[PDB]
Design a protein around this ligand. Sequence first.
Ligand SMILES: NC(=O)c1ccc(I)c([N+](=O)[O-])c1
Ligand SMILES: NC(=O)c1ccc(I)c([N+](=O)[O-])c1
Ligand SMILES: NC(=O)c1ccc(I)c([N+](=O)[O-])c1
Ligand SMILES: [Zn+2]
Length: 199
Amino acid sequence: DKEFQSVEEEMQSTVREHRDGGHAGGIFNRYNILKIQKVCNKKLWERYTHRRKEVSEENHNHANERMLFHGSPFVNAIIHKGFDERHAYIGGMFGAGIYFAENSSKSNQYVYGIGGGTGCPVHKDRSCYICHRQLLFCRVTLGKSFLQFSAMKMAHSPPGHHSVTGRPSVNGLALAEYVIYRGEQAYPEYLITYQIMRP
Ligand SMILES: NC(=O)c1ccc(I)c([N+](=O)[O-])c1
Ligand SMILES: NC(=O)c1ccc(I)c([N+](=O)[O-])c1
Ligand SMILES: NC(=O)c1ccc(I)c([N+](=O)[O-])c1
Ligand SMILES: [Zn+2]
């Protein structure tokens, strides 16, 4: 209903023009939203809320929950098993965490692998306008989030913190990114099936 409409609006309005000129994610200004499904995995939801309650107790009764995008070739494993820090992006700017973006076009750069990988499996095109892509729109508990501008290779959250917020800087980050170090600190709420569209 209006629930899915607000997801599509969030998806469309957070697109940015990327500095790599579309190298990783493709050349587009909008998507063709094909499908939006709400993921209902009861064991995952309980694992997520149990940790959410715990983080709230450690952050002045505030979870600091945000709706953030995740792009990955492992969407199906995430949907069934949940996010898993044992599969963290080690090559990441903030070390061994699970990365999220508030810009859908940033998470779109990661759907086929790091830097878009080799693109779609059928045409090997990072800018494929034919193949259907999937992105997750997630509930992410940031708790007490550590604000950082430069690269900091963490294995875990910094002491007394529950996440890292990568803020844009000149050297530096173009857009924000959010890093959790425990899989249970995110729930894959919505599965968005989409195509990027030729401008
Ligand atoms: N997707 C959700 O926000 C959500 C809310 C409540 C539940 I009980 C579940 N669930 O996956 O079982 C999901
Ligand atoms: N790399 C993998 O085989 C893999 C398995 C499970 C997961 I939850 C992930 N993951 O990075 O989302 C990756
Ligand atoms: N490991 C991933 O799939 C991944 C890595 C970095 C990022 I910035 C994202 N992301 O969706 O924002 C995902
Ligand atoms: Zn393709």
